[model samples]
Target: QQMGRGSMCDAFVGTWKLVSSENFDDYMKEVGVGFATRKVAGMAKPNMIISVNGDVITIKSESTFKNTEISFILGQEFDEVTADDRKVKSTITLDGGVLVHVQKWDGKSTTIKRKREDDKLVVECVMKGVTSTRVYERA
Candidate 1:
């Protein structure tokens, strides 16, 4: 059950909870987040709600501090607001069962990859010289 297009996309239609996060603080700082914000963000556990409808997909990231929702079609570019409140142009593509998301703002670029690893959702986010890996369990 690959989670990319057609019936495979249905596999991602569910809620997931952040079970673990690695190097998230460094990743945030690499994206230009301040120290105060980074400290708080490191303690917050985010929840992701994924909804897939035909060619459209929406991902809602909810945490104690903020809720960010992104809606886009596969292989398309769109405007997005980051959790740190940065406005960026984003593109998402399905590559080999994984969803690759790219965002660009202020000459900086970020890449985030989402895939189902076993029973959980594994997300790897990279910005500047830092990288973060977040694992979410289906909820």
Candidate 2:
């Protein structure tokens, strides 16, 4: 189950495994990261560690596949990035109170939104629409 923002602690923490990916091609296209970057992003198995304290959030992504992470504070607008060269300096926040992360990234037509539900994670990389949805399972 997804944990609410008002809850005791950060919902995302510890290590998680890459169980599966869906509509990844569309996600890669939305970001406009070139072929090399896309390949790098998808080829590797990335795992993450999320540490949240109050309004601050730190994310660590590690993998033999791809090594990277995006660290930002909630409600703090910043440049969101993808595996490729695409980047947007935008703000991120939670939507509907709990699980959704709404990110207003720059450049492309879309703002990024993230949500965790029932053993899967969904990302809306495009502004007006939901471009891609990926999944992760607890290890």
* Cα error, candidate 2, residue 26 (Å): 2.2
Model 2 ranges off by over 4 Å: 1-9, 97-106, 127-130
lDDT of 1 by residue, 1-139 (tens): 5655566766677999999999998899889899888887788888899998768899998998688999999988999988788899999998888899999999889999999989999999998668899999987
Count of residue pairs whose backbone atoms collide, per candidate: 0, 6
Best by lDDT: 1
* TM agreement with the true structure for every prediction: 0.92, 0.72
Q: What's the TM for model 1?
A: 0.92
RMSD (Å) of each candidate, 1 decimal: 3.7, 5.0
Cα error, residue 20 of model 2, in Å, equals: 1.3
lDDT of candidate 2 over 1-139, digit per residue (tens)? 5554654334566567666776666677665557776776776667767677556676666877456577777677666554454465655566563444444345345555555777654444553444665566676
Error of 2 at 78 (Å): 2.1
Q: Tell me how far candidate 2 lies from the true structure as C-alpha RMSD in angstroms.
A: 5.0
lDDT (C-alpha, whole model) for all candidates: 0.89, 0.59
